[PDB]
């Protein structure tokens, strides 16, 4: 079905993506710029869906409609290689991910069955200023492309991609950014997920991890046993007064990478201000009262498809200026362990390879490919991806 | 996060 390796991607032919303004897989890119110019007259009519299906923009402020969306995502969205785990989306998490500053309701693009009005498709866009090499451009982040399992392999994904493209074209944006575990034309970077076990018994019980060849259950827990409290002086939850300095640290820290977001202070508030079961941010306030570092990870539980529920933490943004990142992420592990997380997940992007092995992370079986729509630029190493 | 990884 999908190609997960570049070698596996040699087989595939892209009947759809060959038509899109994206670089070709095999081609080596030595340029910076769009694949196609801006279109100055935009199709006003929605693209045709297969018979019995119609468009409907999802008003996530409506409770029942938002319930349809997570019920769709909780039952039909991204899975593991072995169909054993699926993300478990809270209504509040979707509001956090789908209603950042500048969100537009028409960018909550759903597909319903005409006769029943049942939600069977979705795709999203949120506004995002992206720094890529020497260029900053207003783009969108495309996420939650989802087709109901009963509708699969019926060419609905190209329509969602092309309709969301049209609705973004109407608002004047011509580039987009998105990530995926499958290989498409053409990844600008490939990042690898690593996993840090916090509650090995539960992880091993549900077969999320295995005991390495020669450990026992009680040996494994001692290997991954963490301090009961964090090491770092003056580590505390982020507060409203920290929003400017958090924005300041994040802005300067991201400048060393080649693929980063460019956040306003209001966007920084939305994405980092702690929300229970959604996002946690802890700042380091030193002996002078200045905030010099922060760590963050978001909450995204996993549903166990055999089935009760696996709570996982995902590294988000971790900025260091005076506190070693190793000690910053070690505190993150401890803070996540307190909060009851079973596993701490992080990609090998940014500076994360410098601490992954030392902090007892184990490499995962899934990659995350980063893509740009209508933007031709050289690929980058994972450590240059800051998105 | 647009991928689900397990420890390999
Ligand atoms: C300026 C504005 C531009 C905005 C647009 C920017 C681009 C938007 C990019 C959107 C990415 C958002 C990032 C995320 O949300 S990644 C998360 C996507 N979700 C999942 O992988 C889990 C749930 N899966 C599904 O619902 C379906 O399997 C999907 C929706 C993935 C495909 O549905 P279905 O199973 O029914 O397949 P089809 O018969 O309709 O279509 C087959 C065609 O679709 C190509 N395909 C398959 N998977 C993806 C994919 N993950 N990104 C882009 N294209 C994909 C496929 O190679 C083939 O094209 P080609 O092989 O002929 O080329």
Domain range summary for chain A, segments of one domain joined by +: 1-387
Regarding the beta carbon of A178 and ligand 1, being less than 6 Å apart is answered yes
A145 marked as binding residue: yes
CA atoms within 13 A on the CB side of A300: 22
Ligand 1 nearest-atom number relative to CA A18: 63
Residues linked to residue A7 through DSSP beta bridges, in sequence order: none
How many C-beta atoms surround the C-beta of residue A184 within 10 A? 19
Token duo for residue A238? 């982020």
Chain A residue whose CA is closest to B7: A364
Burial category of A182 from C-beta neighbours within 10 Å (exposed 0-12, middle 13-18, buried 19 and up): middle
Which residues make beta-bridge pairs with A261? A130
Q: Which residues make beta-bridge pairs with A178? A: A371
Residue B4: which of A87, A179, A197 has the nearest Cβ? A87
Size of interface A-B (CB pairs under 8 A): 65
Confirm or reject contact between A301 and chain B (CB < 8 A).
no
Q: Which residues of B are less than 8 Å from A78 in CB distance?
A: 1-4
Q: Which CATH architecture has domain A1-387?
A: 3-Layer(aba) Sandwich (3.40)
Is A264 labelled as part of a ligand binding site? Answer: no
- Grouping H, G, I as helix, E, B as strand and the rest as coil, residue A196 is strand
Q: A225 near A360, Cβ under 8 Å? A: no
**Which of A316, A366, A369 should be substituted to probe chain B, the one whose Cβ sees the most B Cβ atoms within 10 Å?**
A366
Q: What share of chain A is helix, strand, coil (3-state, %, to 5)?
A: 25, 30, 45
Of A84, A300, A363, the CB nearest to B8: A363
Which residue is associated with the tokens 């991609």? Answer: A161
How far is Cα A275 from Cα A280, in angstroms, rounded to an integer?
6
In 3D space, the residue among A238, A262, A239 whose CA is nearest the CA of residue A386 turns out to be: A262
Rounded to a whole number, what is the distance in Å from the CA of A9 to chain B's nearest CA? 17
Q: Which residue of A has its CA nearest to B6?
A: A364
Task: Count CB-CB contacts under 10 A for residue A214.
Answer: 6
| Rounded Cα distance, A53 and A115, in Å | 8
A188 Cβ inside 6 Å of ligand 1: no
Asked if A364 and B6 come within 8 Å (Cβ–Cβ), the reply is yes
Residues of A in contact with B6 (CB under 8 A): 80-82, 84-85, 195, 208-209, 364-366
Contacts of A176 (CB under 8 A, 6+ apart): A125, A139, A140, A141, A142, A165, A168, A372, A373, A374
Contact predicate A88/A74, CB 8 Å:
yes
Using a 6 Å cutoff on CB, does residue A102 contact ligand 1?
no
A44: left (phi over 0), alpha (psi -120 to 50) or beta: alpha
Q: Is A373 in the pocket of ligand 1 (CB under 6 A)?
A: yes
Q: How was this structure determined?
A: X-ray
Does A365 touch chain B if contact means CB atoms closer than 8 Å? yes
Q: Is A124 in the pocket of ligand 1 (CB under 6 A)?
A: no
Residue A197 forms contact with B (CB below 8 Å) = yes
Q: Report whether A172 contacts A130 (CB < 8 A).
A: no
Task: State the Cα–Cα distance between residues A161 and A184, nearest whole angstrom.
Answer: 13
Maximum Cα interatomic distance, chain B, rounded to a whole number of Å: 18
Largest interatomic CA distance in chain A? 66
Which residues are within 8 A (CB) of A7 and not within 5 positions of it... i.e. 6 or more apart? none
Half-sphere exposure of A146 (CA within 13 A, CB side): 28
């Amino acid at each position: 079905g999908p190609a997960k390796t570049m070698e596996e991607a040699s087989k595939r032919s892209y009947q759809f993506w060959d038509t899109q303004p994206v670089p070709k897989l095999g081609e080596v890119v030595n340029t910076h710029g769009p694949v196609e110019p801006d279109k100055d007259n935009i199709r006003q009519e929605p693209y045709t869906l297969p018979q019995g299906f119609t468009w409907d923009a999802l008003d996530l402020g409506d409770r029942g409609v938002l319930k349809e969306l997570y019920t769709l995502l909780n039952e039909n969205y991204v899975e593991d290689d072995d169909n054993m785990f699926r993300f478990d989306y809270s209504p509040e998490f979707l509001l956090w991910a789908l209603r950042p500053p500048g969100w537009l309701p028409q960018w909550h693009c759903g597909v319903r069955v005409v006769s029943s009005r049942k939600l069977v498709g979705f795709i999203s866009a949120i506004p995002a200023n992206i720094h890529i090499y020497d260029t900053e451009k207003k783009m969108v982040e495309i996420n939650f492309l989802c087709v109901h399992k009963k509708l699969r392999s019926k060419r609905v994904a190209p329509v969602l991609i092309r309709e969301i493209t049209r609705r973004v074209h109407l608002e004047g944006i011509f580039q987009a950014v998105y990530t995926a575990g499958v290989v498409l034309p053409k990844p600008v970077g490939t990042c690898r997920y690593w996993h840090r076990s916090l509650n090995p018994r539960k992880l091993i019980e549900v077969k999320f991890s295995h005991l390495s060849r020669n450990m026992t259950m009680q040996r494994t827990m001692k290997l991954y046993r963490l301090p009961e409290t964090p090491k770092t002086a003056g580590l505390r939850p982020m507060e409203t007064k920290d929003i400017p300095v958090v924005h300041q640290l994040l802005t300067r820290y991201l400048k060393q990478f080649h693929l980063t977001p460019v956040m306003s202070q209001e966007e920084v508030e939305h994405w980092f201000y702690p929300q229970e079961n959604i996002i946690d941010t802890f700042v380091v306030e030193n002996a002078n009262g200045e905030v010099t570092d922060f760590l963050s990870f978001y909450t995204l539980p996993s549903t166990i498809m055999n089935h009760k529920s696996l709570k996982a933490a995902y590294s988000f943004y971790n900025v260091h200026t005076q506190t070693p990142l190793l000690d910053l992420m070690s505190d993150a592990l401890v803070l996540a362990k307190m909060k009851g997380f079973d596993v701490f997940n992080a990609l090998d992007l940014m500076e994360n390879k410098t601490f992954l092995e030392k902090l007892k992370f184990g490499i995962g079986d899934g990659n995350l490919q980063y893509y740009l729509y209508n933007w031709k630029c050289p690929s980058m190493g994972a450590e240059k991806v800051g998105l | 996060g647009n991928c689900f990884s397990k420890p390999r």
